[PDB]
């Protein structure tokens, strides 16, 4: 919150106002307690009080840098920003009692009120009967929005009324549906929404939007990959690898939500009519096949694992659509021969049964399976 500058007039002193009022008197006495003072001083005091409180409050609520509450909400509505609303805590409550007992929707169950703490009220969302088994589970929701609620496992123990045959009411697991928004956070949201241009959803705009999501290292776009103005978004993670499904879903929701209901519309960065889908390139697995011969006493598994690590380190350098240098992989294998790191000899060195540099196309490359041929 920025400190509010105030005009000099609005912060005038009460004595200054009274002196300005009394400047015109020169015949009648203006001493404290005199009738002229009686007529004039309360006016000056009220003027100072109103001018210092009400007008300064008006100035404070005028701008979003210092507004608050409903005023800040309206100033957010000026540029179409709404503060996130709270939700009621939700979960399941276990019940136990006589089988003939029936529990109806809308029943009220609360926590244990004490001197230190008040009871948190909850309501059942379902009507059930205990007829089949002595124990039943009923969905329930807190009657108060906000982070209040979200109680621990066995917190729910109190029934306001009394239901025939009920032996015990205990919540089985902690509730998670509760949530409150901070005024300063909402103000920061309002002040962040101030971009001037570069909002058309071009290739550069979509690349920027993909980069804005954390975990996205590089992004690429295909225009009308499926026609009808469709847009593909090929994304690489921070380490040039294939983006995970969770990251793909995050970027998709950020740019183009897919879970919109009937009474909802997309809030993503994609404008109207721009169909968007997030994709990741395929991870090619480079399986190495050669007739490895290992040194005296060396474990084949350990040496092959070290070679796997080295080749994977090399392949991490390769980007999307790069070229896998088979001739370089030959020397990756032979470096251990030079350093005598277990590999005594090798032959028929191939990458997926290939002896030439492979060019990636819409693909990233990762380490495959290191296989010793053991040719008879």
């Amino acid at each position: 919150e920025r400190e509010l500058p105030i005009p000099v007039f609005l912060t005038e002193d009460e004595d200054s106002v009274h002196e300005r009022m009394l400047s015109n008197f020169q015949d009648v006495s203006t001493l404290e307690g005199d009738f002229i003072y009686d007529a004039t001083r309360p006016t000056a005091e009220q003027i100072a009080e109103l001018k210092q409180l009400g007008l300064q409050n008006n100035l404070k609520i005028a701008f979003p840098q210092t507004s608050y509450g409903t005023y800040l909400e309206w100033l957010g509505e000026c540029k179409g920003v709404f503060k996130n609303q709270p939700t009621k805590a939700t979960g399941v409550i276990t019940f136990t009692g006589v089988q003939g007992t029936i529990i109806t929707k809308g029943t009220i169950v609360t926590t244990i009120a004490t001197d230190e703490k008040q009871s948190i009220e909850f309501e059942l969302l379902e009507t059930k009967t205990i007829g089949e088994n002595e124990t039943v589970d009923i969905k329930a929701e807190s009657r108060i929005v906000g982070t209040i609620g979200n109680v621990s496992k066995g917190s729910i123990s109190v029934l306001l009324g009394s239901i025939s045959g009920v032996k015990s009411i205990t919540n089985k697991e902690d509730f998670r549906g509760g949530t409150d928004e901070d005024e300063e956070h909402f103000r920061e949201r309002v002040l962040v929404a101030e971009q001037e241009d570069k909002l058309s959803g071009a290739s550069s705009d979509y690349i920027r939007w993909a980069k804005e999501v954390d975990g996205v290292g590089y992004a690429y776009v295909v225009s009308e990959w499926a026609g009808a103005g469709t847009v593909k978004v090929l994304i690489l993670d921070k380490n040039r690898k294939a983006a995970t499904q969770e990251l793909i879903d995050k970027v998709q929701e950020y740019i183009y939500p897919l879970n919109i209901s009937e009474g909802e519309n997309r809030d993503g960065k994609a404008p109207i009519g721009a169909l968007v889908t997030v994709v990741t390139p395929d991870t090619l697995l480079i399986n190495v096949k050669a007739s490895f011969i290992f040194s005296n006493g060396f474990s084949e598994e350990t040496v092959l694992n070290n070679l796997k690590t080295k080749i994977d380190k090399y392949l991490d350098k390769i980007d999307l659509g790069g070229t896998v240098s088979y001739n370089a992989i030959q020397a990756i294998v032979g470096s251990m021969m030079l350093t005598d790191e277990g590999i005594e000899d090798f032959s028929n060195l191939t990458i997926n049964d290939v002896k030439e540099n492979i060019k990636l196309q819409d693909q990233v490359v990762g380490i495959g399976e290191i296989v010793n041929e053991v040719v008879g």
Binding site: G297, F298, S299, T302, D340, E341, G342
Partner: protein
């Protein structure tokens, strides 16, 4: 009640109100477990600073002395190799050569000081016997011996 020794000590170091406090007791049990692990790690680190008790630091020692690091090999064999490599930096008197070869093999050795003009004899003795392969000992002897001298061997149980 706290199980960790350091946890109990740290809890007792505070005010006595926490006799019945399960929360603080569990907190300092966790902290004491962390400090016990750190103390054991410190002792392990004290082991790594030497080639005799190098343990997983034997890889560091082998990398230091230039020997080939191979985990599958016996730890004692790696220790013997490291010690023999380290001890090779002074005069090849019979005492030093004998102790170097003894440290490498681990079996008792007596250098014969052979009668022939430019040969030296080496005699091995092991109560547990030897394997059928001991070529690397001959390789190290050839690398380490004076250039103008020849060598002969015999082994005893």
């Amino acid at each position: 009640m706290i199980a960790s020794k350091k946890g109990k000590e740290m809890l007792l170091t505070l005010s006595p109100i926490y006799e019945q406090s399960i929360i603080m007791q569990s907190l300092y049990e966790a902290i004491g477990s962390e400090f016990d692990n750190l103390e054991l790690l410190d002792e392990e680190i004290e082991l790594q600073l030497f080639p005799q008790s190098a343990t997983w630091g034997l890889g560091f020692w082998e990398n230091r002395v230039g020997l080939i690091t191979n985990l599958d090999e016996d730890m004692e064999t790696r220790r013997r190799k490291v010690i023999a490599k380290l001890q090779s930096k002074y005069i090849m008197t019979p005492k030093r050569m004998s102790m170097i070869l003894q440290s490498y093999t681990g079996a008792n050795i007596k250098i014969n000081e052979n009668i022939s003009p430019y040969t030296f004899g080496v005699e091995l003795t092991s109560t547990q016997g030897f394997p059928k392969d001991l070529e690397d000992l001959y390789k190290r002897v050839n690398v380490i011996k004076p250039s103008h001298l020849a060598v002969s061997y015999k082994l005893v149980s």
